[model samples]
Target chain A: GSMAFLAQLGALADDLVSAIVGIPQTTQRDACRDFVLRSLRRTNQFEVQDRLNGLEERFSIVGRDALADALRTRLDALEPHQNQFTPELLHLLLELAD
Target chain B: KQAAAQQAVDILHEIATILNCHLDRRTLSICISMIENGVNPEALANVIKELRVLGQDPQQLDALVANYLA
Candidate 1:
């Protein structure tokens, strides 16, 4: 259910650093990231799109242009893909890359 | 086979006890889902880690998860 997805996503975001720490570098972390990533990708399309739009609205409300642009670029990059990353997952990856 | 899942359920019960709050059905359901979906020991460990970070006291659950992972 989308509520389950949202609850899990909120848990991840509440401690985003812990959620992704050492991801891709350590086996444990990598598996954790993959699990959450897969779960997120499994969420319903309408829910994901709605969450992304809500995030964009949030960024605009907060006047965080840079964050909004970064999000947009990530979305654009995923446009050609059949399965896509949600904004929250994309944000998690971006934070990891930094 | 059911050991870890049962342990997680017990831990959730303990969490509710310690927090002095009733645990929601959805939360317990999510815990079960995580346990079922976790394919490896590490994955299971992460779910418990998530549970702890979400609100359960790490001092209590971290060692439990570490022990299970070990």
Candidate 2:
């Protein structure tokens, strides 16, 4: 049976896959490698420390995703709070809660 | 299978609530999709841990993702 959350989650994955698809490559390995390198390169920074910041910004989404993935495995074990987050963040949280 | 996967994602949101980690649903969904695509879970886990230890540096993150596909 199809589920809303999975559908929503899968959509996010699609965004990433589509991002990679736009970048020409072979094999999953090259796909991911090129994904990072190319994005960072395109993000260009001036002499004011552009290279490092550019790369970090590009990679941030994947980094956060990986951590969240591992944390999800804990199931009921995951740890909580609210009001601390901005409205935009909390709004998404509420959507997922449904 | 779809039902169970849906439930897993459903509760996963709850986990974030109690844990206080603001791992967004979109990002979490991406990770789930990555796992489905045959990326090594252990290798993926290693990346997660290293990302933290590396203090979220791009060099280390890039190096790991580059090698992780191996």
Candidate 3:
């Protein structure tokens, strides 16, 4: 379950960057994203949360909690809203944002 | 439909072999049953393919199999 969610998380993070403003399109951002991906690949939630901190720290992304809530709240509109996938993904994001 | 079922089962066996994935016939059968009964295949396939890393820790995989089998 985590493996499947992990792959979807990668794609969603890319979309997240686009949806949220002020996240620059650059090498440093990509590096941070890759680090997050690596963490998820290992199924290490601790490291994943750690890298998310770094992602926001480096980029200074604000309103992440609200954004996560919005994404989760409007999932049916923004995404397919297929079963646990939507909430599970948002849980990951929420944990990261925290 | 028995022939078609056998064909599908044969493909799964081969895919597991080439992908370096383990498939416990018992759990695999249960998993197949679940897929037929409305459980999402996308989620199941992802977890199944991740059998690569799962092999490193058999217990971890078992927990997942046990967790998802319901």
Candidate 4:
């Protein structure tokens, strides 16, 4: 089930981001967020942006600004953890974006 | 199920040819695995999203994946 695999990967993104956001130490939180955000931006391309835009529309938003906030909120609500699945998922996303 | 897997691969090739885009090994491998696993139409939509997230052209690949699944 590739689709399930994709959903799982997407969920991984949500979870990773959420876990990063919830870092108990406020100092590490900013650094973690910055690292992930920079990585995401570096991976930005037509394909990933297109999908995120679609995601925003699905959330009924008009622009990336709005969608970014919505995405943040969604990411915040998800449970996070580090595991084998997370790195593979992140790599695929990076590859997709590349 | 076999036919669907072949169909997906064919579409991926077509996407590369027409759109000048290609899925990376991991992306392609997962897609093949998913198709062989008997992905349903409902799941195809999600796959398309993942493809887009991975930087596949939604305009072309999206319709192709939908049609193949349909």
On lDDT, the leading prediction is 1
Going through the candidates in order, what fraction of the true interface contacts does each contain?
A: 0.00, 0.06, 0.00, 0.00
TM-score of 2: 0.31
| Candidate 3 segments exceeding 4 Å error | A1-98, B1-4, B45-70
2 or 3, greater by DockQ: 2
- Model 3 TM-score is 0.26
- Please list all clashing residue pairs in model 3, or write none if there are none: none
Model-by-model lDDT, in order? 0.42, 0.40, 0.40, 0.38
Q: What does the i-RMS of model 1 come to? A: 15.9
Predictions' DockQ, in order: 0.03, 0.08, 0.02, 0.02
lDDT of 1 by residue, B1-70 (tens): 7345444445334333322233343443443354333222234334444544523443544453354456
* Sliding window of 10 residues with minimal summed lDDT for model 1 chain B: B14-23
TM-score of chain B of each: 0.31, 0.50, 0.47, 0.36
**Candidate 1 ranges with C-alpha deviation above 4 Å:** A1-42, A84-98, B1-58, B62-70
Clashing pairs in 4: A2-B34, A47-B55, A96-B54
True contacts kept of 2: 0.06
* Predicted candidate 2 versus true structure: per-residue lDDT over A5-59, tens digit per residue: 3444344334544432233334443444344323222111232133223333544
What's the TM-score of chain A alone for every prediction? 0.42, 0.21, 0.30, 0.26
The parts of candidate 4 lying over 4 Å away from their true place are A1-98, B1-11, B20-22, B50-70
